[PDB]
Design a protein around this ligand. Structure first.
Ligand SMILES: OC[C@H]1O[C@H](O[C@H]2[C@H](O)[C@@H](O)[C@@H](O)O[C@@H]2CO)[C@H](O)[C@@H](O)[C@@H]1O
Length: 370
């Protein structure tokens, strides 16, 4: 069981967890309530396992796409902030955490992937994905490469797959059709074929992950990378002269990144629900609270209107929002977990050459509509 009179918080290890730990220390000085911040590996998978038994953290942080599945299993408490508190966050961020008409989380920040480039290697970023093979050929002649990014997580390849027609679930009439899936369609095959051809032609390696791409870019070995807000702090330290901009178009269509709203849910088994609420509304969801996390690892565009006005001046945040406006808020429906696992498998098999693109996407389509 969860201990009473204390707060345990789980947040991903790529977030500003030290910063969040500081907001917890502030809460503890004022109220006497100890706050413990942890970042278990695979917490988005572990949470449903432990929460099912009345264990786990009092508060869990993740993008909103996972939350409909948790709420469906009865693992999240319904939150009911008063209208006054609600008016402080952007309306659309509240929409991302509404499930079956109920609020199941507090929206924290908005994030989308962007194109990041080394201005010393590339004064101007490519406008199309199609010109990258040629950029790479010339950069290779100088000992560098054009682009390196995480190919192990479908989140990073999805903008290209969706660019010319790929989609997860058909949204229509204020509802998602869990039977109308678009991973096996023409647009999706075109996008993933482009990706697989980059690897075949030696422009990228199928095994590239987050650390391999980060190391290469921050070292000045590659002219471009694709990443989210959290990557910015480490690039700042690298002293690389970088720019953050809009992703390239594919077949003349803009890349469409999935947009995630970092959110905070309260475990339905938690005996400390009123403490969690006090912490979230009066300590974390304040200019001071968000600034502390943001300083540890950039949150992106925050849900709190008052603090977002100040961050909006940052060109990196502008680029982030521009990429978001071209993408799509991820669905929060329970089927999202099956979508993500099926698309991860498809991308890795196709990229590693274990299956062809058609075989890979066909299996995913089948799995998701099961
Ligand atoms: O790649 C599948 C994965 O994508 C998203 O996870 C993101 C997350 O939203 C970001 O905050 C950051 O942590 O990077 C993750 C990708 O490594 C989905 O939110 C997640 O459910 C999904 O499995």
């Amino acid at each position: 069981k969860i201990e009473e009179g204390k707060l345990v918080i789980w947040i991903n290890g790529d977030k500003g967890y030290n910063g969040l730990a500081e907001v917890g220390k502030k809460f503890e000085k004022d109220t006497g309530i100890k706050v413990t911040v942890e970042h278990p590996d695979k917490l988005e998978e572990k949470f449903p396992q432990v929460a099912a038994t009345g264990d786990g953290p009092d508060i869990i942080f993740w993008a909103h796409d996972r939350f409909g599945g948790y709420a469906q299993s009865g693992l999240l408490a319904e939150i009911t902030p008063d209208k006054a508190f609600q008016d402080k966050l952007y309306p659309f961020t509240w929409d991302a955490v509404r499930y079956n008409g109920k609020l199941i989380a507090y929206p924290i920040a908005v994030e989308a992937l962007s194109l990041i480039y080394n201005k010393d290697l590339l004064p101007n970023p490519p406008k199309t994905w199609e010109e990258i093979p040629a950029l790479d050929k010339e950069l290779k002649a100088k000992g560098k490469s054009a682009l390196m990014f995480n190919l192990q997580e479908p989140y990073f390849t999805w903008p290209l797959i969706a660019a010319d027609g790929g989609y997860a679930f058909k949204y229509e009439n204020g509802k998602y059709d869990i039977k109308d899936v678009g991973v096996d369609n023409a647009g999706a095959k075109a996008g993933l074929t482009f990706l697989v051809d980059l690897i075949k032609n030696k422009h990228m390696n199928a095994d590239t992950d987050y650390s391999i791409a980060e190391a290469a870019f921050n070292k000045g070995e590659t002219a471009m990378t694709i990443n989210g807000p959290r990557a910015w702090s480490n690039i700042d330290t690298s002293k690389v002269n970088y720019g953050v901009t809009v992703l390239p178009t594919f077949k003349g269509q803009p890349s469409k990144p999935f947009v995630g709203v970092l959110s905070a849910g309260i475990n339905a088994a938690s005996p400390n629900k009123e403490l969690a609420k006090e912490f979230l509304e009066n300590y974390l969801l304040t200019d001071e609270g968000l600034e502390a996390v943001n300083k540890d690892k950039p949150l992106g565009a925050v849900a709190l209107k008052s603090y977002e006005e100040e961050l909006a001046k940052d060109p990196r945040i502008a680029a982030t929002m521009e990429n978001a406006q071209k993408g799509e808020i991820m669905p929060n429906i329970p089927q999202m977990s099956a979508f993500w696992y099926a698309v991860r498998t498809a991308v890795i098999n196709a990229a590693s050459g274990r299956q062809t693109v058609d075989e890979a996407l066909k299996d995913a389509q089948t799995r998701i509509t099961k």
